[PDB]
């Protein structure tokens, strides 16, 4: 459930913590699985691009920069890993 299904490593109480930052008071049970689903889709979309940047650099190791360039491409630009 946690090794070829690491998604479950996104712990109910961790998702709670996030939503608590979001200013959420009360949280449906169905949400935990929903959130996983979305996070997957997100990381999928980003990493796909990030890797694609790596594949173009003929590297087999993914860099910080690769990620940033990808996040910028998914209109989610990130400061503090070197714009």
């Amino acid at each position: 459930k946690v090794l070829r299904d690491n998604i479950q490593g996104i712990t109910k109480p961790a998702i709670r913590r996030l939503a608590r930052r979001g200013g959420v008071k009360r949280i449906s049970g169905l949400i935990y699985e929903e959130t996983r689903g979305v996070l997957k889709v997100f990381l999928e979309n980003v990493i796909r691009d990030a890797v694609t940047y790596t594949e173009h650099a003929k590297r087999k190791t993914v860099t910080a920069m690769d990620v940033v360039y990808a996040l910028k491409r998914q209109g989610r630009t990130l400061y503090g890993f070197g714009g």
Binding site: V2, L3, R4, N6, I7, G9, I10, T11, A14, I15, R16, R17, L18, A19, R20, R21, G22, G23, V24, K25, R26, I27, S28, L30, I31, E34, T35, V38, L39, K40, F42, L43, E44, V46, I47, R48, A50, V51, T52, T54, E55, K60, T61, V62, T63, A64, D66, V67, V68, L71, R76, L78, G80, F81
Partner: protein, 100 residues
């Protein structure tokens, strides 16, 4: 010698104040890392990552979700509710223009 008990929602409110004010990442760093690599393997095998490239992702993720929730919360409230539900998210994302 007696039940002392906070009423449902009083600790939530505390938790909010506590985590709003702080900036430390809120997902456990390994379970996340493992997740990253698992999803990587979909697109190419035997891939390495700068320790910074992982952290970088995690930052973006958490912040995104925190964002989503903020918006989701507002979708819930709009329905005269205080409890977020799948349908609340599904709306946010639809308006945000993430899905159809």
């Amino acid at each position: 010698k007696k039940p002392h008990r906070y009423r449902p929602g009083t600790v939530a409110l505390r938790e909010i104040r506590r985590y709003q004010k702080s900036t430390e990442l809120l997902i456990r760093k390994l379970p996340f890392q493992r997740l990253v690599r698992e999803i990587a393997q979909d697109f190419k095998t035997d891939l390495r990552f700068q320790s910074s490239a992982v952290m970088a992702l995690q930052e973006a993720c958490e912040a995104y979700l925190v964002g989503l929730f903020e918006d989701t919360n507002l979708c819930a409230i709009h329905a005269k509710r205080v409890t977020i539900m799948p349908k609340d998210i599904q709306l946010a994302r639809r308006i945000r223009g993430e899905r159809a």
